[PDB]
mmCIF file of C-alpha atoms in Angstrom:
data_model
loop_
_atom_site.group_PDB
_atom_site.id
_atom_site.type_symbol
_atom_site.label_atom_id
_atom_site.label_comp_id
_atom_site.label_asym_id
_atom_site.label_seq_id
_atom_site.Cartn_x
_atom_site.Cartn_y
_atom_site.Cartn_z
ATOM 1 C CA UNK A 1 -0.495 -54.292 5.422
ATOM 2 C CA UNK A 2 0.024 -53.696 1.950
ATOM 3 C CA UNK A 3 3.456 -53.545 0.001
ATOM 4 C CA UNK A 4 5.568 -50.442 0.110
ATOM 5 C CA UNK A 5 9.203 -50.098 0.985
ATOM 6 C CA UNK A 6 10.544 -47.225 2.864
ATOM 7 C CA UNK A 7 14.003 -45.795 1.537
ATOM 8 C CA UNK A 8 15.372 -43.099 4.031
ATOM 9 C CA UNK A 9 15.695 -39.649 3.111
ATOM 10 C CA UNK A 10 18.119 -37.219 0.898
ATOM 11 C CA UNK A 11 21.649 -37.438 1.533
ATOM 12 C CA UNK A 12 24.265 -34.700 1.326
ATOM 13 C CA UNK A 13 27.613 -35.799 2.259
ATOM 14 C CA UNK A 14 30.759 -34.517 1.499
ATOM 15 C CA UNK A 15 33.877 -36.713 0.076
ATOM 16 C CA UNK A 16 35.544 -39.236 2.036
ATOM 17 C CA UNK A 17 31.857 -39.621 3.744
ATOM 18 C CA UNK A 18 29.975 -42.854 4.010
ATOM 19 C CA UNK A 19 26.040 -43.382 3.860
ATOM 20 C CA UNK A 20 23.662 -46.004 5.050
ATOM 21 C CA UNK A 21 20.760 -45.916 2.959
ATOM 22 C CA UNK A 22 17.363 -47.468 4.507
ATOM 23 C CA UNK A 23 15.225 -49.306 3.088
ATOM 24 C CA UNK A 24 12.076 -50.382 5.604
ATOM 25 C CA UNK A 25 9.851 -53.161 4.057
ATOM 26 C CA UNK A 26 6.203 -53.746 4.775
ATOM 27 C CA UNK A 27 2.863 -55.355 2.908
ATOM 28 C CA UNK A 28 4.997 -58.710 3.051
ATOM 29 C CA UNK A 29 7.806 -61.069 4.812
ATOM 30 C CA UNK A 30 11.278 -59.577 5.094
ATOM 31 C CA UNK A 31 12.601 -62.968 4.621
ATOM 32 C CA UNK A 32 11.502 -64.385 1.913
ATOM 33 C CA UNK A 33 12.442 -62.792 -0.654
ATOM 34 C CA UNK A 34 15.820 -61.233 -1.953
ATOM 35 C CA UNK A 35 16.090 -57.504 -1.921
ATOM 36 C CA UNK A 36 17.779 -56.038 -4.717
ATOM 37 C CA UNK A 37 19.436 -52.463 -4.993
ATOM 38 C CA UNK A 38 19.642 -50.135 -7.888
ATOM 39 C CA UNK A 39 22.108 -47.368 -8.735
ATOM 40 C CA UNK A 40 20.524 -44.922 -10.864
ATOM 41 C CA UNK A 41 23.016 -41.599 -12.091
ATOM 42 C CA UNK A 42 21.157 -39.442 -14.813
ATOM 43 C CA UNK A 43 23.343 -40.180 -16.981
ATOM 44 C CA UNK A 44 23.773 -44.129 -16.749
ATOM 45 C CA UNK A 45 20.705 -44.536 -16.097
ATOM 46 C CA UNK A 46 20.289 -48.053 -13.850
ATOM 47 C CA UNK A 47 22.597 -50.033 -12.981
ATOM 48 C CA UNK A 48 22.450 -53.202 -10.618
ATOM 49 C CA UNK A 49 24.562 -53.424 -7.307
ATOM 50 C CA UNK A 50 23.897 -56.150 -5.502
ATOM 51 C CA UNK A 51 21.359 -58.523 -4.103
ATOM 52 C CA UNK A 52 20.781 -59.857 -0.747
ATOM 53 C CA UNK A 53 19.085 -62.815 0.707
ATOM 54 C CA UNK A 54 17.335 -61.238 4.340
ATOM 55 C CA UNK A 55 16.720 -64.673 5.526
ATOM 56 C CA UNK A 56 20.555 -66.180 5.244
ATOM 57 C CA UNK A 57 21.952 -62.704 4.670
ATOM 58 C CA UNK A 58 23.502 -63.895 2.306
ATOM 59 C CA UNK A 59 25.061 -60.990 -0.296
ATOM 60 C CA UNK A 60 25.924 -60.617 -4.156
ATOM 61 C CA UNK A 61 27.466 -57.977 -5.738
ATOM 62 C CA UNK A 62 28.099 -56.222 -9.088
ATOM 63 C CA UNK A 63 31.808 -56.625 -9.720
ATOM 64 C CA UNK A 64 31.693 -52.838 -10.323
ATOM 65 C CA UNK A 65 30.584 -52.062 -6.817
ATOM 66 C CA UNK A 66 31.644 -54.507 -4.620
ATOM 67 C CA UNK A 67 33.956 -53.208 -2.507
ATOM 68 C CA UNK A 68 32.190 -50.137 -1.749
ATOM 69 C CA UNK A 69 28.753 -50.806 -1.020
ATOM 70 C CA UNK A 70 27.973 -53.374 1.734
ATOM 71 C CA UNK A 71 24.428 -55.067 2.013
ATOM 72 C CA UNK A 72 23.709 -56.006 5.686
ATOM 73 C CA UNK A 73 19.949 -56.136 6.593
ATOM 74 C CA UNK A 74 18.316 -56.309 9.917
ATOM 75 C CA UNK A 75 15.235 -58.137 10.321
ATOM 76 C CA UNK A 76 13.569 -57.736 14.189
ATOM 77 C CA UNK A 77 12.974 -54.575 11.818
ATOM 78 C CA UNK A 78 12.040 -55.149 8.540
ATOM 79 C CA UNK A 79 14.528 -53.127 7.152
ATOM 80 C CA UNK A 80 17.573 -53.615 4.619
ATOM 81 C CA UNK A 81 20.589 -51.690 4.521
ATOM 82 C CA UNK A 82 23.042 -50.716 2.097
ATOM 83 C CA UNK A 83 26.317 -48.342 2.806
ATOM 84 C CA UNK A 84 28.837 -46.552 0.237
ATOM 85 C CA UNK A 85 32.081 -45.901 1.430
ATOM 86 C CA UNK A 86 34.882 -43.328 0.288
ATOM 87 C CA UNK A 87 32.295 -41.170 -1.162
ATOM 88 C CA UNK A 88 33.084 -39.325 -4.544
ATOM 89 C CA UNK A 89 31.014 -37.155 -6.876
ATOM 90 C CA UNK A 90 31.236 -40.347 -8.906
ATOM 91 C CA UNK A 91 28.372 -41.603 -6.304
ATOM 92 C CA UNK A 92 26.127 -38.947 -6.838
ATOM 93 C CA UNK A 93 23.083 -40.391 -8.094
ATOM 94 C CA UNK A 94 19.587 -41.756 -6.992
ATOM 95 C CA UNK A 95 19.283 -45.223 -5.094
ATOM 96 C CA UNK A 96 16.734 -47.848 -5.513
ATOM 97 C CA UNK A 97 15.385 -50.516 -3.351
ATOM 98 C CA UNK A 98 13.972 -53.457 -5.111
ATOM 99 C CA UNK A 99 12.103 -56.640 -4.155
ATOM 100 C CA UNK A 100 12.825 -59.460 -6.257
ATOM 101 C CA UNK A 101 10.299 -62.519 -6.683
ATOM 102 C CA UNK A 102 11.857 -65.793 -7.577
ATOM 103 C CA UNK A 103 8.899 -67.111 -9.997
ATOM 104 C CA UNK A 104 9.978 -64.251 -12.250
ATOM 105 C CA UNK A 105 13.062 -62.808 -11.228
ATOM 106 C CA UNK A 106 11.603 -59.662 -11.268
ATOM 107 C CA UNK A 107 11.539 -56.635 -9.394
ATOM 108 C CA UNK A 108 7.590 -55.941 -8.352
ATOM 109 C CA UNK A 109 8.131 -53.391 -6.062
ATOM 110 C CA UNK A 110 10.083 -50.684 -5.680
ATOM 111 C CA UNK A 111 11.238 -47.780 -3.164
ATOM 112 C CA UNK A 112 10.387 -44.504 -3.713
ATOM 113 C CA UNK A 113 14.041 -43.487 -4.143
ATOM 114 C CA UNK A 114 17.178 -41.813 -2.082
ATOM 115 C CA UNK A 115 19.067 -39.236 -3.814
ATOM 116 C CA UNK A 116 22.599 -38.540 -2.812
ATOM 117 C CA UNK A 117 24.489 -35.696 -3.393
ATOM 118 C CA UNK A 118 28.310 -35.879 -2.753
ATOM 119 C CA UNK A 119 29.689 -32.642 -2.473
ATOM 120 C CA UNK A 120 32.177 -30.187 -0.197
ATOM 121 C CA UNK A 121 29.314 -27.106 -0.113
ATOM 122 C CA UNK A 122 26.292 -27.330 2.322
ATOM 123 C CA UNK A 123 23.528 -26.608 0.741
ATOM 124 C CA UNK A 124 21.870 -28.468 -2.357
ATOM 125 C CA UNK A 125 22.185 -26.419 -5.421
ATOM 126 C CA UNK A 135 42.419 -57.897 -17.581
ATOM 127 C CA UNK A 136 40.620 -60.445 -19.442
ATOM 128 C CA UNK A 137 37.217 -61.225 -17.760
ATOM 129 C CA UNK A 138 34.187 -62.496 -18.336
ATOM 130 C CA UNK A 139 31.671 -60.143 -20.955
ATOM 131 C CA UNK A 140 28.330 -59.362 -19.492
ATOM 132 C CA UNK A 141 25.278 -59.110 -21.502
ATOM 133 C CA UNK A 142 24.543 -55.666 -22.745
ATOM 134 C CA UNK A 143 21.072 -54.618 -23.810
ATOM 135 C CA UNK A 144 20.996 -52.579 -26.879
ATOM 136 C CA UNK A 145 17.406 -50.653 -26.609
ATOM 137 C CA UNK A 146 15.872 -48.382 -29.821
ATOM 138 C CA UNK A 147 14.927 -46.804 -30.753
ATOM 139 C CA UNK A 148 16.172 -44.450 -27.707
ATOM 140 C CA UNK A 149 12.982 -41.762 -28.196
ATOM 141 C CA UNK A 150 9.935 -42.341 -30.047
ATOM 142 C CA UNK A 151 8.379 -38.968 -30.285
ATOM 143 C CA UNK A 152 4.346 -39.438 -30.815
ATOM 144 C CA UNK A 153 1.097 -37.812 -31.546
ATOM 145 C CA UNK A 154 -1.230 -39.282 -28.917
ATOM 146 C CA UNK A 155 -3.060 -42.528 -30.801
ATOM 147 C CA UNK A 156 -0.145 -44.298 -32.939
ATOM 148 C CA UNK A 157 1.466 -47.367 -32.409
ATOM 149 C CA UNK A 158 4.708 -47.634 -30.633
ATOM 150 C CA UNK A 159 7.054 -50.416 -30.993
ATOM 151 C CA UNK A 160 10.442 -50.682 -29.105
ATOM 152 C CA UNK A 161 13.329 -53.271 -29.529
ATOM 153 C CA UNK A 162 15.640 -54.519 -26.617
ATOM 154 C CA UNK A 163 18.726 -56.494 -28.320
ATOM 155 C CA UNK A 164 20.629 -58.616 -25.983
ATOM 156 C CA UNK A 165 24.499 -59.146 -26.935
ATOM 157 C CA UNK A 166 23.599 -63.005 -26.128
ATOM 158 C CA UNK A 167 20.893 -65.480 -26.298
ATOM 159 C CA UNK A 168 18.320 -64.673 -22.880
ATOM 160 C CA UNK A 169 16.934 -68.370 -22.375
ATOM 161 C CA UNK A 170 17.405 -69.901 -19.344
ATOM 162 C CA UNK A 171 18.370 -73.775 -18.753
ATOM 163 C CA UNK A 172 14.667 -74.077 -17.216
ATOM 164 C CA UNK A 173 12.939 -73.400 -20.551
ATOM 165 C CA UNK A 174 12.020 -69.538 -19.792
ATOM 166 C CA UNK A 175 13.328 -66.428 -20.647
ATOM 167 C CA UNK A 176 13.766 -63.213 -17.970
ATOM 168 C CA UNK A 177 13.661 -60.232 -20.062
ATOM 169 C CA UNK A 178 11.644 -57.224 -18.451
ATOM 170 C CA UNK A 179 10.540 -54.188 -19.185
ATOM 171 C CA UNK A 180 9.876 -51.662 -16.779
ATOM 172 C CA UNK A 181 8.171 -48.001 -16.979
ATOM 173 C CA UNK A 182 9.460 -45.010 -15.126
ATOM 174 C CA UNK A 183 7.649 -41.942 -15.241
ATOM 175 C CA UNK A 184 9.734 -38.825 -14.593
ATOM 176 C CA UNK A 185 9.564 -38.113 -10.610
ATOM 177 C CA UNK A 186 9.174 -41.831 -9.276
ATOM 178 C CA UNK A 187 10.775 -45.178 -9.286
ATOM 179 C CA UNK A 188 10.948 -47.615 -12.594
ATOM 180 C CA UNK A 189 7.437 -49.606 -12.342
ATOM 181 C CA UNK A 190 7.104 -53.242 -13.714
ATOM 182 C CA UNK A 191 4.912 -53.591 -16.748
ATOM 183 C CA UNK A 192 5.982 -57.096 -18.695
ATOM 184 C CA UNK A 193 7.804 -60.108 -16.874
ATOM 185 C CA UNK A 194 9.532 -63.082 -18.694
ATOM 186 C CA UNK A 195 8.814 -61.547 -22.093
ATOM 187 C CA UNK A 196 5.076 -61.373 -22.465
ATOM 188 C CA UNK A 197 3.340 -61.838 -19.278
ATOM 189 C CA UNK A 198 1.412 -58.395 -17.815
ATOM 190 C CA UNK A 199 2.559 -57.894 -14.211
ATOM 191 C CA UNK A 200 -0.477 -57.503 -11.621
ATOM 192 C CA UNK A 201 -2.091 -54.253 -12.909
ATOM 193 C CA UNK A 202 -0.765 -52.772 -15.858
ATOM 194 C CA UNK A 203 -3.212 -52.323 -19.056
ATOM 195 C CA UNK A 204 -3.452 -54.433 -21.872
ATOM 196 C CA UNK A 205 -2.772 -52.853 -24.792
ATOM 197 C CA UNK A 206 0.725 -53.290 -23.662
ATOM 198 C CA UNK A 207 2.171 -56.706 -24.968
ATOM 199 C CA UNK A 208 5.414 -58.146 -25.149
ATOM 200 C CA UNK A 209 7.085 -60.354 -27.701
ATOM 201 C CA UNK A 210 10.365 -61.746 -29.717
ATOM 202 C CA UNK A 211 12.909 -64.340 -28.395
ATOM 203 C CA UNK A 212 16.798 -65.238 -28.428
ATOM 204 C CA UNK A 213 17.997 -62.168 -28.888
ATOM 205 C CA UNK A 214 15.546 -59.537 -30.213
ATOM 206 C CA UNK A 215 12.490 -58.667 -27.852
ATOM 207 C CA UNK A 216 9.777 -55.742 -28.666
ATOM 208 C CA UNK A 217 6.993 -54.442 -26.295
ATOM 209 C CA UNK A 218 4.230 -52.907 -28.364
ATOM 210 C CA UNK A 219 1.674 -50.547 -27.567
ATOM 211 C CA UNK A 220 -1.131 -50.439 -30.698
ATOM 212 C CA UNK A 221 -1.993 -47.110 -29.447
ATOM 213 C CA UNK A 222 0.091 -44.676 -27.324
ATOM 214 C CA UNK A 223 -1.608 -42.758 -24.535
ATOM 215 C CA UNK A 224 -0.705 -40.167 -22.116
ATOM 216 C CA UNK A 225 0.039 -42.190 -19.196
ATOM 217 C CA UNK A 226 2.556 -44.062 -20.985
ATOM 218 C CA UNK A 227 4.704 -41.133 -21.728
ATOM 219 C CA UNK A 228 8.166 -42.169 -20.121
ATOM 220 C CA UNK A 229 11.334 -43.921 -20.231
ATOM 221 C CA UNK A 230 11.123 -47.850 -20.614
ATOM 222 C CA UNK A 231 13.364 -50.246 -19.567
ATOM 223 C CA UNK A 232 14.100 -53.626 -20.564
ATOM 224 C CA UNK A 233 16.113 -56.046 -18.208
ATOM 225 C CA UNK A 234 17.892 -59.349 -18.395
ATOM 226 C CA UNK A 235 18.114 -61.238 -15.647
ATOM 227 C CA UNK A 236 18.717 -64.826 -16.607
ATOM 228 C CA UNK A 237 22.502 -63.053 -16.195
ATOM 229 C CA UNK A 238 24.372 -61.552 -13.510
ATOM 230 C CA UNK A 239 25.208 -59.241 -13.764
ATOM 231 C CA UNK A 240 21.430 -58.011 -13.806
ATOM 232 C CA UNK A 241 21.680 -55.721 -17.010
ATOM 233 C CA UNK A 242 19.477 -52.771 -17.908
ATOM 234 C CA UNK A 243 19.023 -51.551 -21.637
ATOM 235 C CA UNK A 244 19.551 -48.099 -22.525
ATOM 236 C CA UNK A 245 16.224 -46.851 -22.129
ATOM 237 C CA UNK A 246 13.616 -45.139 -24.486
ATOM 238 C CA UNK A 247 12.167 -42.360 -24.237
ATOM 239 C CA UNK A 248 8.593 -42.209 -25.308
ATOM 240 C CA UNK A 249 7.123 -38.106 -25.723
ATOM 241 C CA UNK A 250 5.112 -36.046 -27.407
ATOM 242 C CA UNK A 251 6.312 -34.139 -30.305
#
């Protein structure tokens, strides 16, 4: 009908527990395309798990979860499906689901979120292989409505791809819902999104840019690489009012 993906709702589970987070798909087809989960703790804020291919069911995972959260999806339904086993307080945190084109490696569209709470009480309240970390500042930009706003993403290591382009993202999440994509591949304005946002740099150092900062882009940006898995979020920055 129209794109939207349906995440089930709050979890409260006490250690030891597992979960099976739902996430039902609809606007588009299950199959083709690769649906992408996000761990989100405040105080880490996002972090990829895994990916998963509906259509060969195919999995990937985030050396850092896999082994404790297992991608199946079921498609009669539209639905994918991610469970966390030998829950810990550790898990706390809110859970993403996350489309992922292939001409941009991006993620479009978004769930509206699951938040899990481990806890015991009922009621609410060796050598390796060095990923790329993105380096974001600076990490709040307090503003007076109307002045421009420039942010830097630094990636440890060089984001072009073998093809010629260059997946560095940046993402807007406004405090309540999921992160929202504003700039793909750099520079290029995602379907919406307003134009006096505009992205730029290369190699290492990016920038987004807004001439003139409004109201209704008050938030937390993100920048992501993803011509490297892991799929690496920056820091964040958070852009208020003074």
């Amino acid at each position: 009908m129209e794109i939207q993906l349906q995440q089930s709702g709050p979890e409260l589970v006490k250690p030891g527990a597992s979960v099976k987070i739902s996430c039902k798909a609809s606007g588009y087809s299950f199959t083709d395309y690769i649906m992408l989960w996000v761990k989100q703790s405040h105080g880490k804020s996002l972090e990829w798990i895994g990916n998963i291919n509906p259509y060969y069911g195919s999995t990937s995972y985030n050396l850092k979860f896999k082994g404790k959260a297992t991608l199946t999806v079921d498609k009669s339904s539209s639905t994918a499906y991610m469970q966390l086993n030998s829950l810990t307080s550790e898990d706390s945190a809110v859970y993403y689901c996350a489309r992922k084109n292939y001409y941009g490696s991006s993620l479009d569209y978004w769930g509206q979120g699951t938040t899990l709470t481990v806890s015991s009480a009922k009621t609410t309240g060796g050598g390796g292989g060095s990923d790329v970390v993105m380096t974001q500042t600076p990490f709040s930009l307090p503003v007076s409505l109307g002045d421009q706003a420039s942010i830097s993403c630094r990636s440890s290591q060089s984001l072009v791809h073998s093809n010629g382009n260059t997946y560095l993202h940046w993402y807007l999440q406004k405090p309540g819902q999921s992160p929202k994509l504003l700039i793909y591949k750099v520079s290029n304005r995602f379907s919406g999104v307003p134009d006096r946002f505009s992205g730029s740099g290369s190699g290492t150092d990016f920038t987004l840019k807004i001439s003139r900062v409004e109201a209704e882009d008050l938030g937390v940006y993100f920048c992501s690489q993803s011509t490297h898995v892991p799929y690496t979020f920056g820091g964040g920055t958070k852009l208020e009012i003074k």
